[PDB]
Ligand binder design. Structure first.
Ligand SMILES: CCCCCCCCCCCCCCCCCC(=O)OC[C@H](COP(=O)([O-])OCC(O)COP(=O)([O-])OC[C@@H](COC(=O)CCCCCCCCCCCCCCCCC)OC(=O)CCCCCCCCCCCCCCCCC)OC(=O)CCCCCCCCCCCCCCCCC
Ligand SMILES: CCCCCCCCCCCCCCCCCC(=O)OC[C@H](COP(=O)([O-])OCC(O)COP(=O)([O-])OC[C@@H](COC(=O)CCCCCCCCCCCCCCCCC)OC(=O)CCCCCCCCCCCCCCCCC)OC(=O)CCCCCCCCCCCCCCCCC
Ligand SMILES: CCCCCCCCCCCCCCCCC[C@@H](O)O[C@H](CO[C@H](O)CCCCCCCCCCCCCCC)COP(=O)(O)OCC[N+](C)(C)C
Ligand SMILES: CCCCCCCCCCCCCCCCC[C@@H](O)O[C@H](CO[C@H](O)CCCCCCCCCCCCCCC)COP(=O)(O)OCC[N+](C)(C)C
Ligand SMILES: CCCCCCCCCCCCCCCCC[C@@H](O)O[C@H](CO[C@H](O)CCCCCCCCCCCCCCC)COP(=O)(O)OCC[N+](C)(C)C
Ligand SMILES: CCCCCCCC/C=C/CCCCCCCC(=O)OC[C@H](COP(=O)(O)OCCN)OC(=O)CCCCCCC/C=C/CCCCCCCC
Ligand SMILES: CCCCCCCC/C=C\CCCCCCCC(=O)OC[C@H](COP(=O)(O)OCCN)OC(=O)CCCCCCC/C=C\CCCCCCCC
Ligand SMILES: CCCCCCCC/C=C\CCCCCCCC(=O)OC[C@H](COP(=O)(O)OCCN)OC(=O)CCCCCCC/C=C\CCCCCCCC
Ligand SMILES: CCCCCCCC/C=C\CCCCCCCC(=O)OC[C@H](COP(=O)(O)OCCN)OC(=O)CCCCCCC/C=C\CCCCCCCC
Lengths: 53, 56, 459, 54, 64, 175, 329, 121, 104
């Protein structure tokens, strides 16, 4: 059981996440983009309610 | 001696039979949740030349 | 999920159709095999969950608890094999049946896609424990202890059923997945305050909270060794699992609501750790140590931060294993001495060296020595509390110190010094007891190699 | 250990409940078996219901 | 046996509600709770105000 | 080494000085490292070559999994559960990716601090500013969500922040 | 390839082999203490090589070899720091331990459990090596607690003696009082700096606030037996003379001073904590010397001398001279 | 939902004719298996009460118990499914015939809804 | 093997029950002194002097030499606080107040 638990496949996707981050940073540095954006979602597709106060 | 140790050791077979029956029941219950098979937006895939279902 | 449930159900006919002198052998072997089967659930995803069907799902919060629940049964059988020797075959079979039913109820409780099913099984676990406590108990106060254990639980949990049916009437579903995706804020209202209280107090009573912890010393002292093991290892964690599951609906009301509980637990850990210093009983001391640890777990759950949840999960697993080991050691002493008081039998290291080594390891792991998972949960909860408020550390500091004290106190009173001259019936420790301690302790030191396996879904 | 855990925490929830339930049970169950008193109470509750619920 | 029984099981049946018992119990069971509640509430109110005005300098604080 | 990309984890050229023996005394370091080489490095190297030719005799490959882009929580109806499920899974994957990004930047910072040694305060300002920027970004997205975090809570936080920013900009323009 | 790392890890690794063989047959013979002594001597003569490499070049290295659990942004790994302090302290500690075991083969000649005594000594040495070579705060805490537990076990070597058990519990109590500040420091560093790693902490703390340094000072006072928490060091003389000579005199009790040395970049940027450290060291050395000049037990006198020397070490730390305090150690 | 007064209801009809348009429960239905298990438990308790070998006293009696339990369970499950089908049919018909009471909610995306955010601190 | 009458009871009020309780705990009537009759549940347990176990005679042949107790003798209510591993009340050459003031 300990051997089985030790060699469990990466269903948590840790190496997948590492490779994704590696490729993403490789691309962003080249483009000159400022790494990770402050906004998690693009503001153009968010419709705020106008205050008019 | 066969037909004699069975009458005393027959009980051992029950736990493994329950395990295989539970595996079969799990697959059978799985068979009833196929409404979205090969329909998820993340995994829309075109079937292989000799493939009928993506997963069983 | 039925690949685990069906063998557990088949454990009953196998036990009842077993030869009169082969019940223990058959039960232990098949329980260990079922535990091995349970190990498959540990391979969780970073995604939602392991949704097997509409009725049962798995989670990396549920999987360690399920594995521990399955692993506990062979240990309970081995511990109970000793004092049930002069007992008829029918009553031993009934005892094994009760243990199997308890495991089945716990297994169905921990998966439980729906909250009403969770409540039904959560309260179904109550009957086998009550019968085990009140039937195969030695003292005359087992009846009062059973009454306390039953009525504290039911007084806590009866409002929970009303709250759950009301929540389903309003929202429309009690399913965990639907509830998580459709969660909406609770307005700060008196009705919402009472709904929060009804949702929380049922799980608070079983931790138990410092105010409501009285039933636990009675139940632990008066129950047999298997009862004490199952109470300290698994039954206390049901409240923590329920809180972690039900807290999602509660926000944003939890912040204001949490203060009475946070203060009660932060002061009650100190109170119970200090109570441990002046105790004349091993079982009561272990029970109060359990109360302190579960008060810390309550604090972690109430803070409700990712590090809090990981620390709470790790601490629950570690405390379950450690407290089961401690109760087993105390029972090994009691079966020789028949007194169950620390100050009577002394200097046992001279007579039983390997058992003294087991005592030392158990006291060290109760003391939260690094890099054990006990201290992993300890430190995660402490860091989360410090981020919550920089003053909490002071209380935490006291707790740690006091904990160490009584732990070594329990190590020094019974193992060190001079052996009592009069006691002469201290026979060499059996292979069964040493195997029990080894099987208790090895999983902890194996898990400290892979902490993420017990850190919960927020890892 | 003694003041809070053994005495006051015990006094508040379990002991108070036991005392109250004992007193209520003693009061309710202590009927001498005289149908005179039973039917006088029946008359009282009948008239109270006629005066209260309409 | 007498020592253990008197220490554990003979306490409550010999309890009598007394001004000394009442005041000591109320103090030792309520005062610390309210003291710590006041302390933590004041600390958290100060922290919440500081984060509302934003003069807290929470740079590099990513784990909670 | 080709096992990892040099651009993702940059390193200086690592200029090293030359040995300049000012005395005729044979130093012990050179003889010690030569005997170490002879007694340790060669057997390890030959064992590695044997293992490498054993590996080449059997060869297989594994492929990194690729994921499509799914509409996020902002393109989901208020009660339509399927799209909310897909968006939540996508958001969790993106959260994991951002965590790994912060990990990479922290690794860069630690490597710089160790490598430049005594002048780490000056020669690691680039990595410090890089980490400050990425930490600022990461904190804004997920700092107060807490346990039971979700895409909806993150979207609500972003909306609150962006209304605050819009009000501040309007007030500054109309000041 | 650059034998510095291989040698500096090989010393610590070969320091563990007798613990592995403690279950073998050699543990049941009378050759076990000589086995442990030879292992320690070989470890010392093998660790002399990285010291020579440092003296020649000034070569420094970090070895983060095994990746432990990673929580969110934070990463925890088995990381060893082989700085000047580590590569300088390891040979001295190994030489002292070699001499101590050679002395103990004769001093414990009539002790029935001499193999267990040697095993206890080797475990303490391994844990102190872990403490000295730690690169992150969690590994340093692991060594911090391990040395304390081994000291508790060795002080109460004669468990039939009440006073030995009392002294061991005293040492545990005072070490937990210091542990409070240690845990406070760990919590503050993780929350504010986002890491337990030494490199990250130095980088993100240009002007260290009061609280983490006060926690570190409390831990150092607890483990170095300063005036506030001094009596456990004199009370620790209940153990066997080799235990007092190895742990409570020259290797274990410098743990707090060594910890304050480890964080000297943050110590120099704060002026109040330096003053507190200086005053604590001065009062500790005065009080301990004053107690020493009038004792009758030789072990008590020499232990008070050790405590006064620790006070002098923290005096050196408080005036912003950490390397000179290391030389004093 | 009091369906006693439903129009066109035969008073003492256990299963109406229109129930025959619904799929019958399968013979391997889990609820039928549970009813058979209940019958088997009844047989075991019957053997135990009369002081007979619990597992192997009367095979015919246990078989009769199981068979009767399965029979009654099958008919009860049929009636259950029919009654639930009636409830759903009535609810759908009432929703269809009263459009003004069940308006079609305007589909709104989360990107244009403002939900208050409560930080966890 | 202990009977019901051998367990501690309520506070003694009359001389006869005081003597009976003194007999129960195996001491003299003149040496017997219960705790003051307040709310705390001391009941009918003797109030032995608050002297520690360390200052007990170390040369007497106790049945428990480490704890310095005899078999049948009554046990102090706070025994576990005075076990020679904890606080002791042995007199010192210097008076308590002088040490406090001098130390302070
Ligand atoms: C240190 C490196 C070791 C490498 C070699 C591998 C060693 C594996 C040991 C596994 C543990 C033993 C099994 C547990 C119960 C004991 C088994 C038993 O029956 O023994 C009988 C056997 C024969 O007994 P006997 O002579 O017949 O009986 C005599 C009497 O009973 C009288 O008995 P006694 O008085 O001789 O008692 C036995 C002895 C030892 O027995 C024990 O107490 C066992 C339990 C000790 C730990 C207690 C829990 C604390 C939490 C630690 C968690 C570590 C988990 C790591 C992964 C573990 C995986 C299993 O007592 C002690 O030495 C106390 C040690 C206290 C250690 C304090 C410091 C702990 C932290 C150290 C750092 C660990 C990680 C380092 C990471 C960074 C660097 C790599 O004695 C032994 O086998 C002793 C074993 C040697 C001591 C090991 C102590 C350290 C172990 C730490 C865990 C493994 C770390 C691996 C990485 C190391 C790098
Ligand atoms: C969650 C769902 C899943 C599990 C379902 C749970 C329930 C299932 C069973 C329900 C009831 C049916 C059976 C009960 C009848 C009672 C008969 C009895 O006592 O047993 C004696 C009998 C052996 O004794 P005997 O030689 O015949 O003669 C001795 C006298 O009978 C009697 O000797 P005695 O009178 O001298 O001994 C005196 C003793 C005897 O008194 C008793 O034992 C009374 C029996 C228990 C009461 C039953 C109440 C009704 C059922 C309620 C179940 C509650 C579940 C809910 C959770 C709450 C837990 C309380 O009484 C006492 O000692 C007094 C104090 C007892 C302690 C406190 C009482 C607590 C009892 C609660 C038990 C609850 C679980 C029962 C499980 C089955 C137990 C047999 O046991 C058996 O052999 C029958 C056991 C089952 C047969 C298994 C055969 C199947 C294997 C082949 C087919 C393979 C299956 C898979 C197919 C595919 C594979 C290839
Ligand atoms: C007696 C004296 C000593 C004699 C023996 C001397 C030898 C000592 C060696 C023993 C320990 C020393 C440390 C050496 C560690 C090397 C092994 C380690 O690296 O493996 C670990 C593996 O261990 C497992 O991860 C942890 C064990 C699993 C624990 C499950 C418990 C077993 C089930 C039993 C029931 C459960 C009860 C409790 C319920 C929760 C960590 O693996 P990991 O770094 O990750 O990655 C492995 C490689 N990958 C990437 C290909 C996957
Ligand atoms: C015994 C062992 C422990 C058991 C468990 C104890 C934990 C449960 C205790 C419950 C915690 C507090 C309950 C209600 C808290 C509400 C907040 C209140 O305290 O603050 C003020 C409330 O003022 C006063 O507290 C009003 C209530 C006073 C009456 C309550 C009784 C006080 C003591 C009773 C304690 C007994 C508890 C156990 C009963 C068996 C705020 O003023 P206001 O803005 O207006 O109200 C805000 C709430 N709104 C928005 C819904 C309106
Ligand atoms: C406690 C467990 C339940 C067991 C109950 C006893 C089982 C043995 C009964 C044997 C068969 C009885 C069926 C009777 C034959 C024909 C019945 C038919 O003519 O009557 C119809 C009605 O059928 C019966 O009512 C159905 C009875 C079935 C009871 C089963 C439900 C049990 C509750 C769930 C627990 C699960 C028990 C499973 C194990 C048996 C028409 O009723 P109607 O004239 O229009 O209106 C009167 C009733 N109203 C007023 C309420 C509307
Ligand atoms: C010790 C536990 C903490 C106890 C704290 C308070 C104790 C004193 C209360 C004694 C019992 C009081 C009974 C009556 C309470 C009434 C509350 C109530 O009705 O709110 C129901 C509320 C809104 O009512 P509606 O009319 O439907 O809303 C429409 C208009 N908004 O709906 C709900 O949330 C239902 C949930 C049930 C409420 C729970 C009632 C019991 C008290 C809560 C549990 C706390 C006690 C737990 C006991 C602890 C023992 C271990
Ligand atoms: C509205 C009414 C609510 C009623 C709630 C009832 C709670 C359940 C407890 C019922 C106990 C009442 C009966 C009782 O205690 O009798 C005294 C009885 C005497 O023992 P007997 O065996 O009956 O005979 C003695 C003489 N030979 O005393 C006892 O033994 C009590 C021992 C167990 C105590 C159980 C404590 C249960 C209460 C815990 C707190 C929760 C209570 C429920 C409401 C809580 C409020 C949120
Ligand atoms: C021994 C007999 C065999 C000898 C010949 C083989 C020699 C080694 C060759 C093996 C190849 C290298 C190898 O083991 O692979 C890496 C593998 C780990 O896999 P990773 O992917 O790098 O990280 C885990 C996540 N994947 O390395 C190992 O685990 C083996 C050695 C690791 C260090 C040894 C363990 C020492 C510490 C024990 C745990 C102590 C508590 C935890 C530390 C606390 C730190 C905060
Ligand atoms: C705040 C900490 C509060 C202290 C906790 C007290 C815990 C009480 C229970 C402990 C159990 C009893 C016990 O251990 O016995 C006392 C035992 C035996 O006495 P001996 O001197 O060894 O006599 C032997 C010869 N016959 O000795 C002890 O260990 C007692 C230790 C108590 C210390 C408490 C005082 C600590 C005060 C420290 C304040 C200074 C802090 C330092 C500031 C540093 C800032 C940079």
């Amino acid at each position: 059981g300990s051997t089985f638990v030790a060699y469990l496949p990466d269903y948590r996707m840790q190496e997948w996440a590492r490779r994704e981050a590696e490729r993403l940073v490789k691309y962003r540095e080249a483009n000159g983009l400022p790494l990770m954006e402050s906004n998690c979602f693009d503001p153009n597709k968010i419709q705020l309610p106008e205050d008019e106060d | 001696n066969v037909l004699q140790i069975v009458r005393d050791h027959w009980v051992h077979i029950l736990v493994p039979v329950g395990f295989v029956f539970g595996c079969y029941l799990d697959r059978r219950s799985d068979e009833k949740l196929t409404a979205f098979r090969n329909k998820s937006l993340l995994f829309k895939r075109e079937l292989r030349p000799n493939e009928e279902v993506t997963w069983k | 999920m039925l690949k685990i449930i069906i063998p557990t159900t088949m454990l009953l006919p196998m036990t009842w159709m077993s030869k009169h002198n082969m019940i223990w052998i058959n039960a232990t072997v098949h329980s260990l095999l079922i535990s091995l089967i349970s190990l498959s659930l540990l391979n969780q995803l970073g995604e939602n969950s392991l949704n097997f069907s509409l009725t049962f799902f798995s989670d990396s919060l549920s999987a360690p608890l399920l594995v521990l629940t399955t692993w506990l049964l062979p240990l309970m059988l081995m511990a109970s094999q000793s004092h049930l020797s002069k007992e008829t075959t029918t009553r031993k079979k009934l005892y094994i049946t009760m243990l199997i039913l308890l495991q089945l109820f716990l297994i169905m409780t921990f998966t439980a896609t729906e909250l009403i099913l969770f409540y039904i099984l959560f309260e179904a676990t109550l009957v086998p424990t009550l019968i085990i406590i009140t039937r195969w108990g030695n003292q005359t106060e087992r009846l009062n202890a059973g009454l306390y254990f039953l009525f504290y639980t039911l007084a806590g949990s009866l409002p929970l059923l009303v709250a759950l049916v009301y929540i389903q009437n309003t929202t429309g579903s009690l399913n965990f997945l639907i509830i998580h995706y459709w969660s909406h804020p609770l307005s700060n209202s008196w009705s919402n305050i009472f709904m929060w209280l009804a949702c929380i107090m049922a799980f608070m009573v079983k931790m138990p909270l410092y105010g409501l912890h009285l039933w636990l010393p009675k139940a632990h002292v008066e129950a047999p060794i298997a009862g004490s093991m199952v109470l300290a290892a698994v039954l206390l964690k049901l409240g923590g699992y329920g809180m972690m599951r039900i807290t999602t609906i509660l926000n944003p009301l939890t912040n204001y609501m949490a203060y009475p509980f946070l203060m009660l637990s932060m002061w009650g850990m100190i109170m119970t750790s200090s109570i441990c210093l002046r105790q004349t009983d091993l079982k009561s001391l272990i029970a109060y140590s359990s109360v302190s640890h579960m008060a810390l777990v309550i604090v972690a759950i109430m803070i409700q931060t990712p590090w809090s949840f990981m620390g709470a999960t790790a601490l629950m697993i570690a405390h379950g294993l450690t407290s089961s080991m401690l109760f087993c050691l105390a029972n090994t002493n009691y079966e020789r001495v028949h007194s169950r008081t620390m100050i009577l039998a002394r200097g046992l290291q001279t007579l039983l060296p390997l058992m003294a080594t087991w005592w030392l390891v158990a006291s060290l792991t109760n003391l939260a020595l690094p890099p054990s998972i006990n201290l992993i949960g300890e430190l995660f909860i402490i860091t989360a509390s410090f981020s919550w408020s920089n003053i909490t550390i002071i209380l935490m500091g006291m707790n740690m110190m006091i904990t160490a004290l009584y732990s070594l106190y329990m190590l020094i009173t019974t193992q060190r010094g001079k052996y009592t001259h009069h006691i002469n019936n201290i026979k060499p420790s059996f292979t069964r007891e040493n195997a029990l301690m080894a099987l208790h302790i090895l999983p902890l030191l194996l898990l400290t190699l892979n902490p993420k396996m017990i850190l919960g879904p927020l890892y | 250990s003694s003041l809070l855990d053994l005495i006051w925490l015990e006094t508040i929830l379990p002991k108070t409940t036991s005392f109250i339930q004992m007193k209520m049970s003693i009061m309710v169950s202590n009927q001498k078996g005289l149908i005179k008193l039973y039917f006088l109470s029946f008359l009282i509750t009948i008239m109270i219901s006629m005066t209260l619920f309409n | 046996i007498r020592w253990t029984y008197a220490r554990s099981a003979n306490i409550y049946p010999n309890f009598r509600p007394t001004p000394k018992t009442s005041l000591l119990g109320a103090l030792f069971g309520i005062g610390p709770l309210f003291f710590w509640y006041y302390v933590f509430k004041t600390d958290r109110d100060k922290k919440e105000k500081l984060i509302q005005e934003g003069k807290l300098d929470q740079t590099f604080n990513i784990s909670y | 080494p080709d096992s990892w990309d040099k651009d993702v984890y940059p390193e200086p050229p690592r200029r090293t000085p030359a040995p300049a023996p000012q005395t005729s005394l044979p130093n012990p370091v050179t003889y010690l490292t030569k005997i170490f080489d002879l007694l340790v490095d060669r057997p390890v190297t030959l064992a590695r070559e044997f293992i490498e030719q054993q590996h080449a005799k059997n060869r297989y490959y594994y492929y990194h999994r690729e994921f499509r882009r799914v509409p996020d929580i902002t393109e989901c109806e208020e009660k339509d559960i399927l799209c909310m499920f897909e968006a939540e899974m996508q958001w969790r994957r993106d959260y994991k990716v951002d965590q790994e990004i912060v990990n990479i930047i922290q690794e860069r910072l630690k490597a710089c601090q160790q490598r430049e040694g005594e002048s780490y305060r000056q020669n690691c300002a680039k990595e410090l500013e890089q980490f400050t920027q990425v930490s600022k970004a990461f904190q804004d997205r997920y700092s107060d969500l807490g346990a039971h975090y979700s895409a909806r809570k993150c979207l609500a936080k972003q909306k609150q922040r962006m209304l605050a920013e819009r009000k501040a900009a309007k007030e500054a323009a109309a000041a | 390839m650059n034998p510095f790392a291989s040698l500096t890890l090989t010393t610590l690794t070969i320091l563990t082999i007798p613990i592995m063989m403690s279950n073998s047959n050699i543990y049941k013979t009378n050759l076990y203490p000589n086995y442990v002594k030879t292992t320690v001597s070989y470890a010392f003569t093998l660790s002399l090589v990285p010291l020579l490499m440092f003296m020649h070049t000034g070569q420094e290295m970090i070895i983060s070899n095994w990746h432990w659990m990673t929580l969110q942004t934070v990463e925890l790994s088995l990381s060893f720091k082989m700085d000047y302090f580590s590569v300088m302290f390891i040979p001295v500690a190994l030489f002292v331990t070699w001499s101590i075991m050679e002395f103990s083969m004769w001093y414990m000649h009539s002790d029935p459990f001499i193999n267990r005594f040697f095993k206890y000594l080797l475990l303490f040495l391994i844990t102190m090596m872990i403490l000295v070579t730690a690169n992150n705060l969690f590994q340093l805490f692991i060594g911090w607690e391990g040395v304390g537990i081994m000291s508790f076990l060795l002080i109460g070597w004669w468990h039939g003696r009440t006073d030995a058990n009392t002294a061991a519990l005293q040492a545990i109590l005072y070490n937990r009082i210091g542990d409070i500040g240690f845990v406070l420091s760990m919590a503050w560093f993780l929350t504010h700096s986002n890491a337990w790693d030494l490199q990250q902490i130095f980088m993100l703390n240009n002007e260290c606030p009061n609280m983490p340094l006060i926690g570190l000072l409390l831990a150092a006072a607890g483990k170095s037996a300063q005036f506030g928490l001094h009596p456990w060091l004199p009370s620790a003389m209940e153990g066997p003379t080799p235990v007092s000579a190895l742990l409570h005199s020259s290797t274990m009790v410098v743990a707090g001073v060594f910890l304050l040395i480890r964080f000297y970049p943050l110590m120099e940027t704060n002026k109040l904590v330096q003053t507190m450290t200086l005053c604590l060291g001065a009062i500790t050395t005065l009080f301990t010397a004053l107690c020493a000049i009038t004792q009758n037990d030789i072990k008590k006198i020499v232990a008070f001398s050790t405590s006064s020397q620790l006070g002098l070490m923290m005096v050196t730390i408080g005036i912003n001279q950490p390397h000179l305090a290391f030389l004093h150690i | 939902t009091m369906m006693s007064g439903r129009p066109g209801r035969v008073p003492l009809q256990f299963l109406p004719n229109e129930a025959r348009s619904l799929p019958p429960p399968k013979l391997t239905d889990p609820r039928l298996v549970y009813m058979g298990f209940l019958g088997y438990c009844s047989g075991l308790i019957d053997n135990a009460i009369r002081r007979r070998p619990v597992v192997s006293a009367g095979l015919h009696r246990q078989l009769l118990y199981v068979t009767s339990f399965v029979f009654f369970g099958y008919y009860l499950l049929k009636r259950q499914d029919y009654m639930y089908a009636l409830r759903d049919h009535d609810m759908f018909a009432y929703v269809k015939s009263h459009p003004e009471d069940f308006p079609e909610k305007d589909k709104k995306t989360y990107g244009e809804i403002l939900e208050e955010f409560h930080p966890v601190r | 093997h202990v009977t019901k009458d051998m367990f501690p009871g309520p506070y003694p009020k009359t001389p006869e029950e005081r003597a009976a309780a003194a007999k129960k705990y195996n001491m003299r009537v003149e040496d017997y002194e219960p705790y003051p009759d307040d709310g705390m549940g001391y009941g009918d347990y003797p109030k032995l002097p608050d002297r520690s176990q360390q200052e007990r005679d170390p040369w007497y042949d106790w049945d428990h030499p480490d704890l310095r107790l005899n078999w049948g003798e009554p046990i102090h209510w706070d025994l576990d606080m005075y076990i020679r591993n904890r606080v002791d009340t042995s007199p010192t050459p210097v008076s308590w107040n002088t040490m406090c003031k001098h130390l302070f």
